[model samples]
Target chain A: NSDDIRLIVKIAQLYYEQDMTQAQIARELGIYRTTISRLLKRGREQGIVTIAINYDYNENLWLEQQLKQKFGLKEAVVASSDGLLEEEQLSAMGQHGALLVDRLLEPGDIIGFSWGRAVRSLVENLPQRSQSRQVICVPIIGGPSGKLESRYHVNTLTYGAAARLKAESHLADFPALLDNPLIRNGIMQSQHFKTISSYWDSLDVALVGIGSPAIRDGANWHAFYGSEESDDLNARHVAGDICSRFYDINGGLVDTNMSEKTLSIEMAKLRQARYSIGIAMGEEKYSGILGALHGRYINCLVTNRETAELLLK
Target chain B: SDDIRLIVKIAQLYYEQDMTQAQIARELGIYRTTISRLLKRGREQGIVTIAINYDYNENLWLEQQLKQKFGLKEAVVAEQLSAMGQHGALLVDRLLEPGDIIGFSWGRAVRSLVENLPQRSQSRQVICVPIIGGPSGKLESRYHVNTLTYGAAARLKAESHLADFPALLDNPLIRNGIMQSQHFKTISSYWDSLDVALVGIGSPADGANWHAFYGSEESDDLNARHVAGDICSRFYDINGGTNMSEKTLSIEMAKLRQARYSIGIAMGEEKYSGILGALHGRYINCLVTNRETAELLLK
Candidate 1:
């Protein structure tokens, strides 16, 4: 009973007191940052933070309350989930990420999406959205999960957020890249990809699934690397990414031939919108999310619930 | 022991003396609400709970006399409150948060709210916005910051974004120029973020402070506009219309129309008329006063 509140407060404290932020906390604790936020809300509504202040000084206390009041925004969480944990950690991560996705999002806002098994899996795990708002879910990366052997796979973040929205979906058909940077550069310059990139920038929000080089053998990374691609990835010291390009564990985007092939979204464009969400799971993935945040790449996050616990540890 | 008795004696004069709230307020140096809350705290804590029942035969007449003399929201009505340690500070404390664009007029009453807020671990990121320039009270103390910016850093538990801008200026162009600066506009642009404003009500002649912050020429300019009571750094009259002031500096009252809450904390029964006039100006929705003034205003 009391544990629910502790679980939630632990998430916030881990992020706040530990200086870990939500994304790192979620990845380590094996829980989504969103789940932690929900716990915090429940705690506050129950009056855990009584006697907030003895006087009104700066309106700081009131302004924090106003965002929730004016925008009707529930608690905003940013944390990544870990793919490997005991069955309990996996479920905890899943439940927490799902809760975060369900709560932070309202109906009606356009949600940009990208295709990946991680995104798809999170989508499948999501509970139905509570409020009714117009929702548009657009994919960020090129191609459908058809390459993954399952079209409706919930492992990819784009698939999950879109599927959750029940909105119309668009898939990019281009291969990760045709050849080297020169050929890949020629294709993106065309109107076809240009239009998609244009609308992708206009989205009210985004949900990106983290991709890691370490996970080349993980089930989540299987689609990205066939035997040939696996050999090619090893040739380069690529680390991780959300949509398609690879980033090192430190979250630095690698300047690889893969970047030419990917439906490259600029970091600045991502921050222009009100919210940018990054999703992933595990301790290995911790540096990716943290570096991404430090690089100002994402504003929001979703992950497994248990990672929140690890984050505190 | 005697220190406690002084408070008890004030309590008795409030309860047993049957004196008008104005007289009791005049007797005490603190704001009326501060006084009312103190009495409430004393009784609820059992220190002054036992009142030796006294009669009020002409209480209605006493109320009318105080009303005409004070010209406040109300003259005299004593209501029972049993809450412990939750008074004006608690009520005001509940209103703190980040992203607040407080229209602060530096004063003693305004500084009091800043002093009493509890320590918070994380700040809410609040900005300290001054209403006027040349505050007369101790300038650099915590009290002034608490009143000037309400210890915005502590209240919100966020970092302090204090307005380094002056409270008043000699000329309107200089005022306009400063307000237009990247530094000032950076914070002022978020004016709509303000959820509440803590204000003080002072009438001209109640204590003319124009000369303290402004030169003779500037004070004359304010007098020419027939300014009366000032809420922030800006002044209004009995009707709440502003035509002039010590400095031409004034935040658009229209901006406050968008604020979620406006709290007025006043002291001295002498300022009762000023409080009444302020409400007429349409800035304050909530008023915190003491039992003495409460009884007097109701009367």
Candidate 2:
């Protein structure tokens, strides 16, 4: 009860500064004196409202930094909204992503692609390239759909991510190659697949959207095909395909039969990339992004500001 | 009859552990409400249901008992998380109330907990109050309530009351004065009215992912005086004790003292100090931690 803040303040003023007794302070705050008694008692129990004073403003950053160290984060963000008006603040994922990506791009950066909603958003706003031709864009995995030019999300998004750098884009077989495990392992053994996989592995920068494990609509699987077929993938708890390869909620991909159909990225190889940024799309992406961001693998990312805030949250 | 007993045992484990009603119901081949009613009736009856009293094992029995011995009302030890740094999230989900007043402190762990709660609890109104300001740049991050007071009223499908002032201050006097403001005092007034206060624990020794002040010499000095494993961004120790010097800029202690229940969720074997200190301070008698840390308890 705020009656306590006032009650405590009133009593503190009366007892210490005003030189009043407990009974007098209680009378002033209009309590049974015993009620005021508990407030002041808990006050002491909490070690607040003391005689000595030691305070400072410089203490803020020190605490913020300590929290950052514990979490292994670039920085921890905290947004506080006074009652009833926080939606505007929670929706800032896109803004934060815009800033993070704007600062991430560097000259000659081989910006690789992971097509999903988040990656598409980053590409949409990324300023037309000041340095064209120098930046190279390669698909991180087989684009989920066959038509790179179609409205299908995977190829279209990958193409869009390449648009930001105005760079040359590598096409990973449209209608994406991995549809089963044998084919996935078979493709991995091939020289052509190995070359693109190696280039994807070697890229200095990568941009992809995080896919949540469960959605009522189960949109995470849409990249590979039309509806219903993708629904079957979700029943198995598949979060989504990173590059044609499927992962369960645990982030383990190859062991499942689902891998037979996915274009797979080796987890061991992901640990080697220089800058692997994981862009998450919505507030819902917290789990998917947290599941995917091993810190040992993904190093840098581009996303909407709202999702950025959620990731940090 | 044997099947019924087995069903009851399974129900208590899932219910007490915070597993979903839907999940438990699905497994039991019964309606979800039937399961909820059974747990409710279990409490209403004088039934000698040992499941609620029994442990999954005696792993941290002493630690939990010590908390009770020290004066905590109740305690739940967390199992090891499936992933690193992911601890007690499932437990917090089990304990949530939709209309409950929730004070959110900015941190990845607590944020993840609020984010991970299942759909069942979404209908209730949950007002979020950010307790500290040093992490102000991040207030907009992962928490469910955006407007502490106002936004919460709409989004949480209930209500909200947020602190508009800085969560922390450089000048003790200024901090004290702002906390004394009419508005600040208003938020302070609602402190005790909160049903449950959920917060994340930060390590004090190295100050890793916690705020820098908590890791620095000054915060160390404060932590030393407060004597704790963890404070909810306020000054305290592993045992849940606090120091009066911190009163000038804090709202949690009052909230802790007045709130009906305070839930502290922490992870990492290294968080022993934070956990121990929090226990010492009595900030949270109820805790959520990974199995590794559960193994390290002195109790």
Candidate 3:
């Protein structure tokens, strides 16, 4: 606390500069001499009075620069891949991604997050901070499922991030992929959608996961766009998606009829952010990441060394 | 103007749809260069005044105080204790316009600024050069003219001019030889026409003692002569006069006065008096610094 810091400085000055005795300092400041002794001892132990800083560079700095120049990106961060499995690597992505997000966050920024395992990992890793200013965390995507699979919903990530940050959360109350266009239209104009959608356009930073290409199967297909439309998307050479908005190999938005009804954020709005960071990893996501980079959908990238190498390749 | 309609259309398309100039040019069957010029010309003609506001409290506070105190055209104080130079780059980026010839002065802060800047398509035709000459000593190698001038010029897509001799040369004969030569003449002539100037503010307390270039007998003499601050290698006090005019080789005081925008980038509480001195001298029309240093300017 600033008050504690100010008090620490006062005590430090009395002992060091003024050369006052502990009993005299106690009488002048009206505090116990033992408390003064504790504060003084703690100062040296905690390094309250500093000496120097280590100025070493990161290991993947060169690769970061290379990716930035190659893709015309604002910034790129690559996590080291010394010895880790896929799950651990994903956690690494989130840890480093959270670190960068912490630096990028200003006091009053309206942070937008999309739903994915990577996004969930990032929020889970972010530690809470007590700041005077508040940030509103808004979910960019709608619910993934109605009642059965609430864990995959955008609110899970949003609530998690907000709770971790001690910030407020604004949630979207619509389904992920609506089969009915009329219901989608009604939900889009509803008060809940309007409340959340109002905070979407002017996002300062957006943390989103880049989805790999969808597989055509009962579990995979229905989970995303329903099993019936999966075959058509696969046939169209669809690369991947950012949230639920799918795109092809060239990063062009897929021209599916249900795309209009998909309760997801607009690519244009996401692109408006000053720092749109895409966090994802895995060998399977190479083409999708490449397409996203080429299209300038995300200005910042956070991934593993192998993933970075795959993109470079 | 007949170009007004096309200019407005290009601006709206770019801002609204986030279309690149090349994309818009391809759509309209025009050259990318033409579209770029139209976007700036559109702004020049008052079709658009783009303002992307960022909230930095201390920055806004210091900026307001600077303007009110000095009656300046503009001032910028970036947030954060570090990256005062990178913040300097951000400030200069806003001040720069298409075809604007910008001048640079050698130092660590200015070097950081040049390196941090992104490539600007609109600043392609603009010229970048060092107002001061090459460093006097090898120990002052980091303050070389080429790194700052060439880096900024290359990134901004602008032309560069490198000064030949040491900025504050001890040898009189060699100094005037390059000073009057074609290379120096080419750079000095551009001084009067400079649309924007970026220079580092140096403190007398920091002179020779902390800096490599400012080392030696002559620097000590200048430091003792009530020299409060140095701009473009020329030492001046709060009164803004060239303390050792005959000895130093840099942009003239008159030339500095004529520049449309003269910016002095400084940081640190130690340089408080120097910053105050520079402010009084009025050699610089603008200042970019850290919040603490900016607060120091008031005292």
**Candidate 1 on A1-313: residue-level lDDT in tens?**
2335446556545543455765677788787667766765554444443211112112222342342343233333322224344444445335445666665666566677655544554566677654445676666666543555454332245544555566656555455445466766777888877876777677677767666555643444545556666556656555556556565545565665455555556655766756766666566666555555445456655544343333333
**Predicted complex 2: CAPRI docking category:** incorrect
Mark the regions of model 3 whose C-alpha exceeds 4 Å error after superposition: A1-59, A146-152, A214-222, B1-299
What does TM-score give for chain A of every model? 0.58, 0.58, 0.77
lDDT of 3 by residue, B24-54 (tens): 9899899988887865544432344432112
Off by over 4 Å in 2: A1-313, B1-74, B78-99, B120-122, B137-156, B206-211, B214-217, B223-226, B237-248, B252-254
Any residue pairs clashing in model 3, and if so which? none
| lDDT string, candidate 3, A1-313, tens digits | 2345456677776765566878999899999978998887655444454321101123366688889988988988787674778679878778778878877888888899887677878887786777634788998888777522455457888888888888888877788677788898998888888888888877878998887654332225456665567667777767877867778778787767668778777888888998899987777777778778767789999988888877776
Q: Where in model 1 is the C-alpha error above 4 Å?
A: A1-91, A106-108, A127-132, A144-147, A151-163, A180-191, A216-237, A304-313, B1-299
Q: Would you estimate the TM-scores of all the predictions?
A: 0.34, 0.34, 0.42
lDDT against the true structure, each candidate: 0.54, 0.54, 0.73
What docking grade applies to model 3? incorrect
- The candidate maximizing TM-score is 3
Q: For model 3, what is the error of residue B81's alpha carbon versus the real structure, in angstroms, after optimal superposition?
A: 58
Candidate 1 scores a chain A TM-score of 0.58
